[PDB]
Enzyme design. Structure first.
Site, PDB file in Angstrom:
ATOM      1  N   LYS A  60      -3.675 -11.112  12.560  1.00  0.00           N
ATOM      2  CA  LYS A  60      -4.407 -11.923  11.581  1.00  0.00           C
ATOM      3  C   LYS A  60      -3.483 -12.831  10.768  1.00  0.00           C
ATOM      4  CE  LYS A  60      -3.978  -7.881   8.804  1.00  0.00           C
ATOM      5  NZ  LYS A  60      -4.598  -6.649   8.259  1.00  0.00           N
ATOM      6  N   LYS A  93      11.790  -2.992   4.084  1.00  0.00           N
ATOM      7  CA  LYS A  93      10.617  -2.203   3.838  1.00  0.00           C
ATOM      8  C   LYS A  93      11.099  -0.844   3.353  1.00  0.00           C
ATOM      9  CE  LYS A  93       6.180  -0.994   5.966  1.00  0.00           C
ATOM     10  NZ  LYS A  93       5.071  -1.542   6.797  1.00  0.00           N
ATOM     11  N   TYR A 133      13.530 -11.665   7.607  1.00  0.00           N
ATOM     12  CA  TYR A 133      12.931 -12.250   6.419  1.00  0.00           C
ATOM     13  C   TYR A 133      12.307 -13.594   6.785  1.00  0.00           C
ATOM     14  CZ  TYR A 133      12.586 -14.594   1.874  1.00  0.00           C
ATOM     15  OH  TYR A 133      12.116 -15.250   0.764  1.00  0.00           O
ATOM     16  N   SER A 190       0.827  -1.203   0.000  1.00  0.00           N
ATOM     17  CA  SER A 190       0.000   0.000   0.000  1.00  0.00           C
ATOM     18  C   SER A 190       0.868   1.263   0.000  1.00  0.00           C
ATOM     19  CB  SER A 190      -0.959   0.000   1.194  1.00  0.00           C
ATOM     20  N   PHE A 191       1.388   1.644   1.165  1.00  0.00           N
ATOM     21  CA  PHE A 191       2.328   2.765   1.217  1.00  0.00           C
ATOM     22  C   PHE A 191       3.779   2.317   1.475  1.00  0.00           C
ATOM     23  CE2 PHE A 191       0.890   2.707   5.690  1.00  0.00           C
ATOM     24  CZ  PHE A 191       2.114   2.641   6.320  1.00  0.00           C
ATOM     25  N   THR A 227      -8.721  -4.986  11.191  1.00  0.00           N
ATOM     26  CA  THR A 227      -9.194  -5.634   9.979  1.00  0.00           C
ATOM     27  C   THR A 227     -10.546  -6.226  10.344  1.00  0.00           C
ATOM     28  OG1 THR A 227      -6.977  -6.170   9.166  1.00  0.00           O
ATOM     29  CG2 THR A 227      -8.821  -7.520   8.337  1.00  0.00           C
ATOM     30  N   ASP A 253       3.933  -6.546  11.230  1.00  0.00           N
ATOM     31  CA  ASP A 253       2.895  -5.523  11.095  1.00  0.00           C
ATOM     32  C   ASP A 253       2.498  -4.803  12.400  1.00  0.00           C
ATOM     33  OD1 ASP A 253       1.053  -4.004   9.683  1.00  0.00           O
ATOM     34  OD2 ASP A 253      -0.460  -5.494   9.812  1.00  0.00           O
ATOM     35  N   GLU A 265       3.125 -15.815   4.481  1.00  0.00           N
ATOM     36  CA  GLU A 265       2.003 -15.633   5.398  1.00  0.00           C
ATOM     37  C   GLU A 265       1.283 -16.914   5.773  1.00  0.00           C
ATOM     38  OE1 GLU A 265      -0.515 -12.728   3.521  1.00  0.00           O
ATOM     39  OE2 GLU A 265       1.201 -11.380   3.246  1.00  0.00           O
ATOM     40  N   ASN A 315      -0.612 -11.470   8.885  1.00  0.00           N
ATOM     41  CA  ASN A 315       0.414 -10.874   9.736  1.00  0.00           C
ATOM     42  C   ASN A 315       1.199 -11.898  10.525  1.00  0.00           C
ATOM     43  OD1 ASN A 315      -0.195  -8.254   9.203  1.00  0.00           O
ATOM     44  ND2 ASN A 315      -1.508  -7.981  11.014  1.00  0.00           N
ATOM     45  N   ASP A 358      -4.068  -5.606  15.353  1.00  0.00           N
ATOM     46  CA  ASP A 358      -4.441  -6.063  14.031  1.00  0.00           C
ATOM     47  C   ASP A 358      -3.923  -7.452  13.746  1.00  0.00           C
ATOM     48  OD1 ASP A 358      -5.575  -6.017  11.516  1.00  0.00           O
ATOM     49  OD2 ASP A 358      -4.053  -4.815  10.681  1.00  0.00           O
TER      50      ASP A 358
HETATM   51  C1  LIG Z   1       1.891  -5.506   2.112  1.00  0.00           C
HETATM   52  N1  LIG Z   1       1.504  -6.901   2.291  1.00  0.00           N
HETATM   53  C2  LIG Z   1       1.582  -7.886   1.213  1.00  0.00           C
HETATM   54  C3  LIG Z   1       0.465  -8.853   1.593  1.00  0.00           C
HETATM   55  C4  LIG Z   1       0.063  -8.530   3.028  1.00  0.00           C
HETATM   56  C5  LIG Z   1       1.006  -7.456   3.551  1.00  0.00           C
HETATM   57  C6  LIG Z   1       2.215  -8.150   4.172  1.00  0.00           C
HETATM   58  C7  LIG Z   1       2.237  -8.317   5.693  1.00  0.00           C
HETATM   59  N2  LIG Z   1       3.655  -8.172   6.035  1.00  0.00           N
HETATM   60  C8  LIG Z   1       4.619  -9.073   5.744  1.00  0.00           C
HETATM   61  C9  LIG Z   1       5.797  -8.509   6.197  1.00  0.00           C
HETATM   62  C10 LIG Z   1       7.123  -9.209   6.134  1.00  0.00           C
HETATM   63  C11 LIG Z   1       7.657 -10.159   5.144  1.00  0.00           C
HETATM   64  C12 LIG Z   1       7.054 -10.681   3.875  1.00  0.00           C
HETATM   65  C13 LIG Z   1       7.288 -11.977   3.444  1.00  0.00           C
HETATM   66  N3  LIG Z   1       6.567 -12.095   2.285  1.00  0.00           N
HETATM   67  C14 LIG Z   1       5.923 -10.919   2.010  1.00  0.00           C
HETATM   68  C15 LIG Z   1       5.082 -10.530   0.965  1.00  0.00           C
HETATM   69  C16 LIG Z   1       4.567  -9.237   0.945  1.00  0.00           C
HETATM   70  C17 LIG Z   1       4.872  -8.332   1.958  1.00  0.00           C
HETATM   71  C18 LIG Z   1       5.714  -8.714   3.003  1.00  0.00           C
HETATM   72  C19 LIG Z   1       6.228  -9.998   3.008  1.00  0.00           C
HETATM   73  C20 LIG Z   1       8.974 -10.551   5.715  1.00  0.00           C
HETATM   74  O1  LIG Z   1       9.793 -11.351   5.143  1.00  0.00           O
HETATM   75  N4  LIG Z   1       9.283  -9.935   6.887  1.00  0.00           N
HETATM   76  C21 LIG Z   1       8.205  -9.156   7.169  1.00  0.00           C
HETATM   77  O2  LIG Z   1       8.160  -8.452   8.244  1.00  0.00           O
HETATM   78  C22 LIG Z   1       5.554  -7.296   6.811  1.00  0.00           C
HETATM   79  C23 LIG Z   1       6.381  -6.368   7.421  1.00  0.00           C
HETATM   80  C24 LIG Z   1       5.803  -5.198   7.918  1.00  0.00           C
HETATM   81  C25 LIG Z   1       4.428  -4.985   7.787  1.00  0.00           C
HETATM   82  C26 LIG Z   1       3.624  -5.933   7.170  1.00  0.00           C
HETATM   83  C27 LIG Z   1       4.189  -7.105   6.678  1.00  0.00           C
HETATM   84 CL   LIG Z   2       2.998 -15.080   1.074  1.00  0.00          CL
END
Ligand SMILES: CN1CCC[C@H]1CCn1cc(C2=C(c3c[nH]c4ccccc34)C(=O)NC2=O)c2ccccc21
Ligand SMILES: [Cl-]
Ligand SMILES: *SCCCC(=O)N1CCN(Cc2cccc3ccccc23)CC1
Ligand SMILES: [Cl-]
Length: 277
Positions: free
Chosen positions: A130, A34, A84, A15-16, A163, A146, A89, A133, A128
């Site tokens: 879920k 990020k 990582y 998103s952002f 959510t 998250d 998810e 997350n 949040d």
């Molecule tokens: C933006 N998103 C893509 C789909 C749902 C949401 C991802 C949720 N999410 C996944 C995160 C992380 C990871 C992710 C692994 N595969 C992904 C795919 C899309 C976005 C993030 C990740 C990670 O390796 N470490 C993380 O902390 C993450 C870190 C900070 C905030 C939200 C986060």
């Molecule tokens: Cl995934």
């Protein structure tokens, strides 16, 4: 640490923020970096999420949590270096295999409970929680992430986040979150592991809100009895009466629930997780 130290690889998600799989060249350590556009964070009105994400993660030191390893910047960007989680998810896995057997449901629910106990111990409320997350690392252990919407208690607090599927009743009717609000989410997540769908389902978010405050959900027939029992003790409108909340005496009773009776709690992170269903 400096940008030049990393290969910025596969975009993991966008998103952002854009999350990229990065490799630190000299150590070969992988991180999820990020990336944020300062100006875009301003225009979308998301600075609170960023500062809060940083503050909270900086307090976390537990295997079941994504850690914030470094932060740096340049003229137009902010970079968060996170743990990582190679297997992505939890959500992906529930969609993929449909619903977990009891052994898997029991083990991952245990890790999440263990995680919440630590978080709540440090007086932090996720707000949040879920499947999206709850991430799985290379060893298939959970890593929660998250924290942008989290709250540090000084009890309860006031904010408008969540959510729909997992939002607690108190957030919708008092506009206030406590630790027990996370336990409500946990209840929804256990249900979803077992049934393959979240419990509160409706035509839109507002209608979902209505289900929640009506306590309007159903257990399909194949639901593991001890899990059903646990879920009923978590999805309770009165936040002071959920298994695991302070008034209910905390985690001791939560971890003692029969659904968990076989669980070896203290070194969960060192156990080989069960093969996924
Ligand atoms: C933006 N998103 C893509 C789909 C749902 C949401 C991802 C949720 N999410 C996944 C995160 C992380 C990871 C992710 C692994 N595969 C992904 C795919 C899309 C976005 C993030 C990740 C990670 O390796 N470490 C993380 O902390 C993450 C870190 C900070 C905030 C939200 C986060
Ligand atoms: Cl995934
Ligand atoms: S990576 C080192 C830590 C960076 C950090 O903590 N922050 C705090 C949040 N901001 C707000 C922000 C965002 C975009 C542009 C800004 C310009 C001036 C002041 C704050 C800004 C900065 C990064
Ligand atoms: Cl996959």
């Amino acid at each position: 640490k400096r940008p030049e130290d990393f290969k910025f690889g596969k975009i993991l998600g966008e998103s952002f923020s854009t999350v990229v799989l990065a490799r630190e060249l000299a150590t070969s350590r992988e991180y999820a970096i990020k990336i944020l556009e300062k100006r875009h964070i301003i225009k979308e009105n998301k600075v609170p999420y960023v500062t809060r994400e940083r503050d909270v993660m900086s307090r976390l030191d537990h295997p079941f949590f994504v850690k914030l390893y470094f932060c740096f910047q340049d003229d137009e960007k902010l970079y968060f270096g996170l743990s990582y989680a190679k297997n992505g998810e939890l959500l992906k896995y529930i969609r993929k295999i449909g619903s977990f057997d009891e052994t898997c449901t029991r083990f991952y629910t245990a890790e999440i409970v263990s995680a919440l106990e630590y978080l709540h111990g440090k007086g932090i409320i996720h707000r949040d929680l879920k499947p999206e997350n709850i991430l799985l690392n290379e060893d298939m252990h959970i890593q929660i992430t998250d924290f942008g919407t989290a709250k540090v208690l000084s009890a309860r607090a006031n904010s408008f986040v969540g959510t729909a599927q997992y939002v607690s009743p108190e957030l919708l009717t008092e506009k206030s979150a406590c630790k027990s609000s996370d336990l409500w989410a946990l209840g929804c997540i256990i249900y979803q592991l077992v049934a393959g769908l979240p419990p509160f389902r409706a035509g839109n978010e507002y209608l979902i809100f209505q289900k929640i405050i009506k306590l309007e959900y159903d257990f399909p027939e194949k639901f593991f009895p001890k899990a059903r029992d646990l879920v009923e003790k978590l999805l309770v409108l009165d936040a002071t009466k959920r298994l695991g909340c302070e008034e209910m005496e905390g985690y001791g009773p939560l971890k003692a629930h029969p659904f968990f009776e076989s669980v070896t709690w203290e070194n969960l992170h060192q156990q080989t997780p069960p093969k996924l269903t």
